[PDB]
Amino acid sequence: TSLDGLPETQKYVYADEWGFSRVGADFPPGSHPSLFSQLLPQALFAFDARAAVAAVAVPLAAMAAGYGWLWYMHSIAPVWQQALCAALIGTGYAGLFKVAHECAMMRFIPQMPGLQAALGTLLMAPALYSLPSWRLHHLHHLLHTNMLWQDVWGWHPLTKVELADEMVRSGGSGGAAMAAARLVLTTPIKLFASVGHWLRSWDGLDLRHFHPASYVEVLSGWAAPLAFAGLVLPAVVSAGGLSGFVSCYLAPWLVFHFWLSVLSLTAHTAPHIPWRAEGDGWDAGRAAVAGTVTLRLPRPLEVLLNNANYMLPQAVAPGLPMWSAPAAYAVLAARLGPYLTEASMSLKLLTNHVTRWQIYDEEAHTYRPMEEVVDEIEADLQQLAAAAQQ
């Protein structure tokens, strides 16, 4: 961790300065997250049908309510009513997508594996996502959490060195890639950068990345999104025209991607969480316990998202079901207390994420704003040009 041994005063002033509640101390090296699976009571792993049907039915009810309203008042309503129904539908679908993510890791209904596979496929299709590819990318993420140059399926930060290289190649700060980075990680559109993730799935639609023994399974995975976008996105358009498309599909889609992106970005990024390269001090347990941030929401939001913010517990006990994630956290907070980091979703946090922590420099091993960093490295460009005198 970045803030090593130091009294509670500087910890807490950093905490309320950045919007976190409890910052974290320092974890010993040489460990593994799967260790602390022994700190969990065995009753947490039990299956019950009540929570299952509740988790699959609450977000469905929210979605149905939003749609019934929106169709009852199709296009006679002003823009704010449309925005509110879109937000409701997007959140309901984020809940159903958390259920599908559970079925992808094989921990929702293990007794009926065919049924849980079919359910995950069905719930993932409307977001145009593939279930087998999702499983693969998530496993690869769990194996490489916070590893520099390797965690490509997470919010890999834009480092100073690659930026300097691109600026030396561009011959100035006016190129195309320059302005692209400029607007993507300086404006609120960052809270939607998850859409980039969506495009990096479909690994070129290239069966040459996978193991041959799995071709038929991967192909099938790609055919459920396509079939949707080939049989249902026509109907919608044909039955509502452009407007009946932008209000019935595109706005809930953008809301869902907001949820996905903000959840992940807040989860694994903070000024006191370093990104060590491989061989240079990367530790697995240290990165999965100390390098994680838990977001706290109002309980209505939580029960709508199926506890989608609680990510730390299911990284130490990958078989821990979804409805036991809150309780389990309370257990770990007792024993791993001094090391965890926590935050509450507020405006200050997102403003800091957008305006302050933009570039990651490894020498200082911290995040710094894009503009001051680029003008500093450009002044050093001028000074090496002066050093290039002869």
Partner: peptide, 15 residues
């Protein structure tokens, strides 16, 4: 309580 513990230990071994 066993169908999830089996999956848990398998995933842990792999990871």
């Amino acid at each position: 309580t066993l169908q999830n513990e089996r999956i848990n230990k398998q995933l842990n071994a792999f990871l």
